[model samples]
Target: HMTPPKAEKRPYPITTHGDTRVDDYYWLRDDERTDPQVLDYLQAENAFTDAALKPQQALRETLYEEMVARENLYFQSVPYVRHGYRYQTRFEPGNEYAIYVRQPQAESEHWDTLIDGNQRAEQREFYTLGGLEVSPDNQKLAVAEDFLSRRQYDIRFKNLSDDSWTDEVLENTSGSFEWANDSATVYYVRKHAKTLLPYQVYRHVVGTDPQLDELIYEEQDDTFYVGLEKTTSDRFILIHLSSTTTSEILLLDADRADSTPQMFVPRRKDHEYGIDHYHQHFYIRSNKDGKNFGLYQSEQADEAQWQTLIAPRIEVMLEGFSLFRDWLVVEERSEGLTQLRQIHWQSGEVKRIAFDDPTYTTWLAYNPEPETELLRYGYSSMTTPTTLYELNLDSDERVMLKQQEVKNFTPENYRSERVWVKARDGVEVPVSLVYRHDSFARGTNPLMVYGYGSYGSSMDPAFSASRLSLLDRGFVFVLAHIRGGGELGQLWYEDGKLFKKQNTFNDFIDVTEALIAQGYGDAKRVFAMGGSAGGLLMGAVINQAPELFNGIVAQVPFVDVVTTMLDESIPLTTGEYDEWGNPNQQAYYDYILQYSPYDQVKAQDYPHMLVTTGLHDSQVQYWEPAKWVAKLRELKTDDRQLLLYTDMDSGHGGKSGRFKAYEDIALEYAFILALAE
Candidate 1:
């Protein structure tokens, strides 16, 4: 007989909004990440998880091998052409990480290695390349790297001309930067050490000491995030400042050195807009009049007098756009499937690029050279592998660049279906499902429901080679496109957030019920999964209706609601008040307390759960899951399995290498399948 590791609860009192509460597991939090007790508890939990899952090592190995074999180890990424160079991130036989190499646009086979992750990966437990940028002259290279999984990057430069490294090392950066046209100067954002927020933009000169780097711009607001990008034509460098519901774009002359960023449009409350430069005009997608954004064009920097190119429609959402010299490709989501619209610049006529699959997702891809007639985009479905296609706007000719391959997989034998489920509130929620045709059984097959209903992020159906293992074993994989997601448009997202947040949870539960009642899955063998905020969904649903699922997987779950929201010191906590309202006020605090998974923990029989998180995760602190599991162990009436796994050396994302991430996934699948038996 084996018992799980029991965490000792040291009662800590927290008072927010005049409401005092005692947290039994609050001592588990070690922000300095060095407390011996915290470290020992995490290691003990990991050991317990391993001991419990040891019996399924063979199943886990097969799952991991199946995933490993599905991938083409020596495959190459699509060559992206930019500034006389063609770059392809390729993998070789023995490497666990990608090898970054590029060739001159004119060369067919010759490639110069810029950075080989295999050779350059840090000899630590965690390693990842944050960013890589070559100078405009292609004579110098800059790389951002993080070895500790804390997500803090250090920028280092290399002179490609002589293969000599620069002595200056830029520290504590946002891990991304844009090169000026002069190539000698680069602009990068700096991260706040404590909050881990990108708050300042600095210009770094190639050969100068990093201490003398000029500060270009700095954001004072903790609630807003800053990002950097270059315009398609390379004429302007853009600094984007945005919050949950608002956006502001700033532009600087890329051709000029040490130029201050000019605000493209003055930021207003709740106004979300984006600007991209085309031939003599600035194209704007703004939600000024409507939540579903509309497209506009301006010859001058005038937001009030911009000419409307497309009026906002109620049924369809203008998702994104790509500008070209002769054509403009606009992406729109109508009836849940995002479709592309091609418009010729001279003719002023619109043509749509349609897909044959009923449930598929497509988005604009890297078409760096705007002068060309070809526009590349990404397409995929629950059954199809991710594919890249290049379509010529002039002749309407389309060519497939690459499609991800799964070894020994048959496309025809698998089937994907889209269906609508009616919720208790009479709203129709969309669900995408796929299963191996030969392994499916009506009302008897096990079901795995996946849903993430937060941040207006759509849960698009995409093919997964590793998921085929579950499909081959008669699992019905389902994606619950619930409210609070951008799937049904902006209004749908608005309806699910704030006081209506329960709709997100209810919709997930309602879909699971409808699918089971419709003879798609076995009620006794059903399992649910979600992560981060989606993991919040898992906690909410399980608290509301624990009988709906047999086992749940909560990955990097954000479950501590009121306490986390009240603390402004946590990374992303201040910025996400717009998503999960500011709890300083009594109303928001009361509302959060109503559904907080930790606060709502009850003394009732509950489903088995496997929770996972990263120790260095800044987004959702590892303490959230650790505290939740410890609380569940104490209060839950049933002796059902409840396990927590912590990646001691990883951050929000798990292991950095390509092949190493499969270990956690294989273990997860093994746990799920073991429960199914």
Candidate 2:
């Protein structure tokens, strides 16, 4: 028998607001990530997980093979032209990462491979080549690379003319930067060594020592996170400083490398705004019109001087916009569906682009050369593979550039739909699901309900090749679009955060219970999955309704909620007060303590559960999930399996290779499948 591993407890006192508690696993916290005691405990947990999963290895490999078989052996992205060169990425079957290449504006027959990621990934367990930006002169290239998967990148330079990589390297950056028109200078976002927050901006000149880089701007407010971007017109480099509810942006003239940053808008607690540049005029997207936001235009940065371009509608939320000489493409949501609203500058005629699918998502792709009539976008639904499209602005001409091909699969064989279920508070919650027609039988099939309700991030219905394995094997996959997400607009997210956070957990449990009652799934074979903040959702749900689910999969879970948020030095802790509420104040302390997962674990018979974490994760910290599992093992009365898998060399995300990523999915599918069957 492969029994679960045991971890020693070192009692530590935690107190706030005259409330005292003892944390037995508090010794697991290691900021430097080098404590031998912590490492051994994680290793032992992984060994037990492996031993327990040994019997299901055969089915695990089969699931893995089926998923990879659908992937294209050779693939290439549609090319986009920038600065007299057409840029695209190509992927070979043997390579784990795509190779970046370019061709001249004249449509030259020969293409040059500018950067090979597979070669860069050699001898490294984790690799991410971020922000491969070419200079405006098109003579040099700058790259932000991370071999550790921690999101802290190393900025490097390559001489395009001589095909030589320089010796220059800037350490611990945000992995994003913008190039100045001079082609010799650049601006980058720097990260703090302790919290890894991108808090500083620096200017760098090519062919110079990084130590001499000039400090451009620094954000003293640790609560606000900072980042940099180049506007659509390429006229300004925008520095964004944002807390959860407040925002301030700084514009740096790209024509001069040494120019100072101008404030686009002053900071306000609840007033949030962002901008796009079109020639000399700055197009502002601000919430002053409504919480859903609206569009305005002004040559100057002041709100008093701006003119309304698109009036705000209470029913529609304007997510973002792409500016062009003739038209503006707006991505918006209405009644929980994603659509594009195109506005012509000359006629002021507004047209809404239509799609055939009932539940789907459409996004703006790279429109690098914004002066043209054609706009690039991508579309997907639960029943279809992702397809890229190019649309002519004036003629309404649309052409599909490419669609992903899945082997032995057809859209007609599967069916997808959406249902609205009433929550405990009488609010309607939407659940999107898909299943193969051949394997589906109402009230008999196994079910998988997935949830992620945090940070105003929406859980839109989308396509997945790997998910087909479950559908083909008589399982129904459901996406629980709960509150705290942007799918239904800002008001929806508001209802699920702060003191009302219980709405998120209740909405999930209510929808699952309603789904079972409606004969959508078997009551005995229900399974659930969530990650990160969603993992926090999984933890809380099982505590309240453990008998509803047969098994659970939590990835990089933020389970130690109150403990993690109380410490300001933790990554993402200080910046997310508006989303999760700061516990330093007594009001929030009493409120969050009501449902904080780790603090609420009790003596109960829980379901079979599988937990996964990356040892190097800075996002959720490996200790959060580690401690939750240890506490559950000590308290839960169930004989069902409780497993933990820690990927030693990876961070918030797992290993580097595309196939390596699939391994985690396969392991998860096998665990639930074993229990469901």
Candidate 3:
């Protein structure tokens, strides 16, 4: 194998709050990605990673094939009827992209191929479909596409019947567009190319010249993002502006395309509310009363008078609600589990759809037209394949429309359960686990624990077909529901963010130790994996307790927290102040500096690690991980394997193609398996 890459030390020292931090590899931060020396070092690291993993090429291929084999080569999605037509997405055996198809509401055989992503993606190195909209009259189709993976989309239109393209193409948009009731008028959000933030909304008339498109709204606040969507009732089009903790919405009549938008609710700090119209009134889910949130109803937009429908509770968190003609579907979480509650309007009846699995996920699915009594939702557990169900609200009976098919796979061979562990501060943490039955002996089995504890985002217990490859090989998988996540409600998230962010890192390490102590994982063979914010968790834990894990896989990790948070010029920095805190203040700066992975790297031994990043990544810049690995290579005393892989073609989500993303997974799995031996 070739010698590992060693980045030159530029010794860039940053001083904050009278504290000096010497960032030796800070020279690697190349926003334009054209610095010759930085490029040479990154390329060398890629070469070293390839040479180091070359020994497991066969094993990686085997894992990839096994994963591909489990996929149903020919799969068609369950169709949903909308506007006198049935819309569905399907995949052919070998294609990397889905084909969107639709036909008459009652007919299945005579379907029109709305968009063949495979054919459009054939000539491009990277391609992804953005916002797709079919006009109300079904005469035209609008599609947004991204060819560079930076998330800047170009929207194009075509005649549905003749498949003829329009000459004008909308450029530099967020790839999301909403169709007005008139079918000819469309509204889309435009982005700031440098930061990739959706800052403006524009209205376009079909067949009109591109320069004539009207600017509908623009967001002046850098912290809030702008978005557009048609209400479920299709009576109004909404322009929503929101930040992490606050929101404001504007509405326009769907039928009147030229009218100005009216304010639904004025923006208020620390108060959040979302509304959906039902018959004459609107149902609102808001945290205006309390942090756990409360359900309210408002009679009209101008009056702004509100009445509580479901009062806020200390234990139950009101996540969201969906309104129908006769029934209301409420999505809630209590005791860290999601529960769907159905309420009748006239009869005043209430019911909660229950799942028997100890750890499972259930949420409302598509219910386009609110006139019907049928409600569709999705359910799954680590051991169960994703199943779609339709409930007759009138009879309270459910019918399974479809359960995803997995080739050469059996659910009976696996087991899933939930376990709670105590953190260092005495707070209880929930961990979800799944493994094959009788696969290996307890206390000595290899295990991989995963976590993502940021942005109040909960990590649900969901199924993964590719995960079967590890379980079938006598391995166990775990999910740590740490703080800063919404698993246990808003309080759980509140306790793990800002100055208290270390609690998230602590909880993850405690869960790993608890699992090892309880014989769920072998102490010397345990591995940890996470992506994005979760990747940040991986970096923090390894820094605090380097000996706790045998291997670490961090995909697109945000390791340079202090630096990234300090620079408002970065894409997500200013908007995430409520999340990571405004580092311009000394208190936040000091607390962040104490734990940031890049700033805390020391001359100590760390476990084998695999770091992956995308050159075009918009969320976490590629330079963060690149600089992190460079610093580790310079200071680490041991010879434990450390590798970095950069995808030059893709961005934050990685390869745009369906199957291409699996190569990264195969590589990570190979690293874990090779180390476990």
Q: All candidates' lDDT scores? A: 0.88, 0.88, 0.87
Greater-lDDT candidate between 2 and 3: 2
Single out the weakest 10-residue window by summed lDDT for candidate 2: 649-658
lDDT digits (tens) for residues 388-466 of candidate 2: 9999989989999999889979889999888999897788888889989988889999999999998889999999999
Please list the residue runs of candidate 3 whose C-alpha ends up more than 4 Å from where it truly belongs after superposition: 122-125, 302-304, 651-656
For candidate 3, write residues 1-677 as lDDT tens digits: 35788889888888877878888888888877789998898889888998999999999999989888887768789898888889999877667778999998978679899998888787787778876778999899999998877678999999987989888888999887889988888888999876778998889998889799998888889688788877787888889888999988898788874868889888989888787776767777888888999988888874258888899998998988788888988999998799999888888799989678987999999888788899999998899989999999889899999997888898889988799998999999999999888776788889899999999999999889989988998788999999999999998999999988999999999999999999887889999999999988998999899999999999999899999999977778888889988888999998988889998888999999999987765468989999999988888888999999988754322223556667778999999999998
Q: Identify the runs in model 1 with alpha carbons over 4 angstroms from their true place.
A: 122-126, 651-656
Best by lDDT: 2
The parts of candidate 2 lying over 4 Å away from their true place are 121-126, 651-656
Candidate 1 matches the true fold with a TM-score of 0.96
Query: RMSD, each candidate, Å?
Result: 2.0, 1.9, 1.9
Residue lDDT tens for model 1, 1-677: 78878899899998887889889999898888889998888899999998988899999999998888898778889889888999998877866677888889999978888887766665666567898988989999999988766678888898987878899988888887989999889999899877778999999898899889999998977677888988777888899898888888889899976699898887788999888887878898999988889999898777877899888999999988999888888988888888899888789988899788867899999888888999999999999999999998888899999999889799998898999998998998999999999878899999999999998999988888888988989999999999989898898898888887889999999999999999999999999999998999999999999999999999999899889998877766777778778889898888878888988888898999999988655358999999999999989998788989998744322223555578888999999999998
